[PDB]
Amino acid sequence: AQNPNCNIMIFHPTKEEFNDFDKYIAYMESQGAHRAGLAKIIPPKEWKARETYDNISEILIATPLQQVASGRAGVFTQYHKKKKAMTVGEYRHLANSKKYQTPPHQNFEDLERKYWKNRIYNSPIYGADISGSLFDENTKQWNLGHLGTIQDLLEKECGVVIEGVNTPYLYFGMWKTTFAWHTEDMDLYSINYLHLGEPKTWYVVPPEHGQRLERLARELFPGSSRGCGAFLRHKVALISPTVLKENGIPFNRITQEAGEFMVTFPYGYHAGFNHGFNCAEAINFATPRWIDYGKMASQCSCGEARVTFSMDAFVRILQPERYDLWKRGQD
Numbered sequence: 001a002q003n004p005n006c007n008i009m010i011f012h013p014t015k016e017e018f019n020d021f022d023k024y025i026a027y028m029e030s031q032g033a034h035r036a037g038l039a040k041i042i043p044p045k046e047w048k049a050r051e052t053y054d055n056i057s058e059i060l061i062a063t064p065l066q067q068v069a070s071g072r073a074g075v076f077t078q079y080h081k082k083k084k085a086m087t088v089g090e091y092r093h094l095a096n097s098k099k100y101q102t103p104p105h106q107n108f109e110d111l112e113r114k115y116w117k118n119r120i121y122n123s124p125i126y127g128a129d130i131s132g133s134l135f136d137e138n139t140k141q142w143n144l145g146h147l148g149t150i151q152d153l154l155e156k157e158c159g160v161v162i163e164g165v166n167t168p169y170l171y172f173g174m175w176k177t178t179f180a181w182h183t184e185d186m187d188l189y190s191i192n193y194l195h196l197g198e199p200k201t202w203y204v205v206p207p208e209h210g211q212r213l214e215r216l217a218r219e220l221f222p223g224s225s226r227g228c229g230a231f232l233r234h235k236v237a238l239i240s241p242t243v244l245k246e247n248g249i250p251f252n253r254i255t256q257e258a259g260e261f262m263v264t265f266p267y268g269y270h271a272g273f274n275h276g277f278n279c280a281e282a283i284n285f286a287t288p289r290w291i292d293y294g295k296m297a298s299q300c301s302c303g304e305a306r307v308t309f310s311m312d313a314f315v316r317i318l319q320p321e322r323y324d325l326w327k328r329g330q331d
């Protein structure tokens with residue numbers, strides 16, 4: 001068995017190997033990459049996502065989210081308070097202000113220490129979940145707006161034709177902006193490209209151990225757990241690496257830098273934070289190996305998780321027993 005310790009693997013495809021996205025994903029899995037839940041892909045030196053970022057300040061962040069924490073430094077939830085719209089140029093200036101800017105630090109490890117010590121005492125503003133793309137239309141390799149759709153994968157594997165679309169999302173971050181512990185909708189893959197700016201630190205639990213993280217989360221967030229049998233779908237809970245280590249939960253960590261891709265694999269729980277002003281692009285995708293994960297994915301029916309249009313068909317076809325309850329949650 002490849003990668004039996006579930007380490008995060010880093011790949012360096014050549015320009016030839018970067019042509020065929022599906023083939024490369026299947027290669028990485030042949031080497032055991034999925035066992036970690038997360039992999040890094042460094043593009044060949046010949047590749048670029050677009051020519052420059054000199055012209056992005058006019059993108060609108062219609063609903064910036066202030067991420068307000070409750071709890072203790074290592075175990076907390078965050079809620080998203082909606083803020084007035086602002087442009088990317090306005091948001092970058094805010095990120096760089098004395099109130100929000102990255103503190104002085106020695107290296108990524110020192111910054112990580114400072115994040116876990118101090119996150120809860122601040123409320124950073126995240127421009128998350130913005131439909132759109134920064135890849136040039138002429139970029140033909142690993143262009144996250146030109147991937148094969150999940151609907152087409154389901155159709156190719158299962159023969160069923162369904163409604164829905166699959167488009168990318170932009171994320172504008174600042175110091176301490178946080179993504180809570182989650183797997184993807186329907187335990188899909190994700191791919192995330194860091195277009196510019198400061199790094200993103202990731203934490204990940206191997207898919208084979210995801211239920212260990214779920215059991216700890218039920219213990220740590222007991223009221224939330226009574227409220228919903230899949231409350232990590234709410235994407236509000238944080239648990240630090242120190243707390244994970246104290247409770248014996250297997251995990252790994254890695255820092256993504258500008259110009260790098262990360263792939264999350266089906267049922268790979270992940271969480272993390274931004275180091276400073278940055279911009280990422282991410283999308284969900286599927287492969288044949290996902291189908292079985294999609295069939296078994298948990299679902300929130302309490303009403304909190306509220307998701308896209310396109311998840312309806314996935315539930316309806318892969319999980320027809322759950323469909324009626326899940327749809328009540330959506331309505």
Ligand SMILES: O=C(O)CNC(=O)C(=O)O
Pocket residue numbers: 171178179190191192264270280282283
């Ligand atoms: O970048 C972020 O804030 C969150 N991204 C992801 O969870 C992802 O790409 O799967």
Ligand SMILES: [Mg+2]
Pocket residue numbers: 055056057058059
């Ligand atoms: Mg612009």
Ligand code: NI
Pocket residue numbers: 182183184190264270
């Ligand atoms: Ni994710």
Ligand SMILES: [Zn+2]
Pocket residue numbers: 227228229230231233234300301302303304305
């Ligand atoms: Zn729920």
